[PDB]
Every structure is written in structure tokens, then in C-alpha cells.
Design a binder for this molecule. Structure first.
Ligand SMILES: OC[C@H]1O[C@@H](O)[C@H](O)[C@@H](O)[C@@H]1O
Length: 278
């Protein structure tokens, strides 16, 4: 227990549906300088058991300096699959678990570190718990396999001021550039967000009636290939506020009425693992 941000340990939570392929569990938190272990368990129960079937047990140990991935079933654990723990007592943590048909995929600071092969049915994760020497600051889950080129309507009300669009993506490793488009009903692009890795810039621009306007670009490109990031398109009243990886990357004064931005478009060298309106 420390500064009440919320999220008390032990933190248990019930899943709406079972944990399907494409969906991701994301657990951020801060660690004290006296922390030895915390744990993440994708389990089932009975309503809530407290020791029955755990398809994916992650134990992060600062004493042993390794992340331990195991699976408790039929009363036992099995062969520990170990892996070097890149964390140091102190600093934040960023564990993100993605289910697939074949296996779990666990990634640290947005960098894949472990491909845990499914040992008992994934269909048995109905709960997840987080426990131990850790302060939890962010636990989110959801998502699906997002096909790219992506295209889809946004909600109904669309993205209007007071709403952010939250996109969790990962630029492809040998990819030169990708784009995201927030769209208006008539066709126009409200904001064209276009990280170009070749030009080492993130070009921002609007497409009005067939023709692209000026093109705003100042900004150290923060994305890195093969690494995943948290793109956030925060629609304020006078500008979008673009957030990359927790911090404001750039603002973009509206060149079009931010009301009724009801379409989304993601192209290029990128994998999309989460979309959500907020
Ligand atoms: O090709 C059209 C558009 O593509 C993007 O890469 C640029 O950022 C836009 O300003 C350009 O007009």
C-alpha cells in the first residue's frame, strides 16, 4: 500500500467474456526500492476459488532477477520457463499479455520478451489477479486482431471535443512508414497522422476537398520500429492534442470543425492491437 492512486493489492478482477485471441491485458505500475516480487495470474475459479487452475502465472522477482512464467493446474505447477527480468528495484513496470491460439505473448516496456506456449485451455482464463510488492497505476484489457489497412466507422456520435481516441499500435520492424486518419462524414480528413521513419519525422496535416493543406512536422519522432506505443488523439476544443507513450507529442489546431469526426483509417507498416474511444 502507498499513495492512493487506487488499485489495491491483492487486485482481482472478473472478465466479461473469456480471454480470446487478439485481446491484450496491460498492467502498468510503480515499484518501491524494497520490492522483491509481484505476480500476475490469468486464472479461473468457481465465482472465486483462490487456488485452482492458472493458465498463465507470471512472477517478476527482483531478488532472483528473472521473470518466471509457469502454469498451475491439477494442483501442481510445472516446468518453469524463465527469462531475464529487465526491471530494477524502483522504476515503473509495463507488462502486456496478448493471447493467441498457439500461445501467450508477454511484453515488457512494450518489447516482446516471452512467447509462452499454451499448456491448459486459454478458455479457462476468467479472472486475472495482481499481487505483491507493486503499486498498480493502470490495468486495461480488451482489443482484437485489427486488420490493416483498417477502415471503420467511429461509434455514432463519432470523435468530438471532450473525447480521445486511444490507439495501441506497433510499427512494423522493417517498415518505412504508416498513417492514421481521423475522418469526417463528407470525406475530408480532419487529421492525417503520418509517422515517416525514413524522414525521421511525424507529419500532421488535413485533407480538405481533395487537397492537402500545409503540413506540420516539428517533433522528434518518438516511435521506434518493432516497439509498440500508445497513440492518443485527444480532441480538445481548439486543437487535437496528440499523445505518444504517456506524453504530449504535438498539438494540431483544428483546420476543420472537430464535430462529427465519425470515421477512422489506419494504413501502412503497422500492427494495431487496440482501438478505443474515451
Ligand atoms: O500523399 C498525400 C499526403 O501524404 C502524407 O504523407 C503527407 O503528410 C500529407 O501532407 C500529404 O499531402
Amino acid at each position: 500500500m502507498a499513495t492512493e492512486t487506487n488499485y489495491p493489492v491483492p487486485y482481482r478482477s472478473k472478465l466479461t467474456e473469456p480471454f480470446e485471441p487478439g485481446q491484450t491485458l496491460i498492467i502498468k505500475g510503480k515499484t518501491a526500492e524494497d520490492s522483491v516480487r509481484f505476480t500476475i495470474n490469468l486464472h479461473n475459479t468457481s465465482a472465486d476459488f483462490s487456488g485452482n487452475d492458472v493458465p498463465l502465472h507470471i512472477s517478476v522477482r527482483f531478488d532472483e532477477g528473472k521473470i518466471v512464467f509457469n502454469t498451475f493446474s491439477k494442483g501442481e505447477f510445472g516446468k518453469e520457463e524463465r527469462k531475464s527480468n529487465p526491471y530494477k528495484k524502483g522504476d515503473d513496470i509495463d507488462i502486456r499479455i496478448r493471447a493467441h491460439d498457439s500461445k501467450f505473448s508477454i511484453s515488457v516496456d512494450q518489447k516482446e520478451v516471452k512467447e509462452y506456449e499454451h499448456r491448459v485451455p486459454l478458455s479457462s482464463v476468467t479472472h486475472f489477479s495482481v499481487d505483491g510488492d507493486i503499486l498498480i497505476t493502470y490495468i486495461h484489457w480488451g482489443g482484437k486482431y485489427y486488420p490493416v489497412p483498417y477502415e471503420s466507422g467511429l461509434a455514432g456520435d463519432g470523435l468530438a471535443p471532450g473525447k480521445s481516441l486511444l490507439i495501441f499500435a506497433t510499427p512494423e520492424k522493417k517498415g518505412k512508414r504508416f498513417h492514421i486518419n481521423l475522418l469526417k462524414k463528407n470525406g475530408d480528413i480532419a487529421l492525417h497522422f503520418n509517422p515517416r521513419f525514413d524522414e525521421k519525422a511525424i507529419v500532421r496535416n488535413s485533407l480538405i476537398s481533395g487537397e492537402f493543406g500545409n503540413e506540420e512536422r516539428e517533433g522528434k519522432n518518438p516511435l521506434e520500429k518493432g516497439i509498440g506505443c500508445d497513440l492518443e488523439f485527444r480532441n480538445e476544443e481548439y486543437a487535437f492534442q496528440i499523445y505518444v507513450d504517456g506524453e504530449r507529442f504535438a498539438t494540431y489546431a483544428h483546420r476543420l470543425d472537430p464535430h462529427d469526426i465519425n470515421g477512422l483509417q489506419i494504413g501502412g507498416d503497422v500492427e494495431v492491437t487496440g482501438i478505443q474511444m474515451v
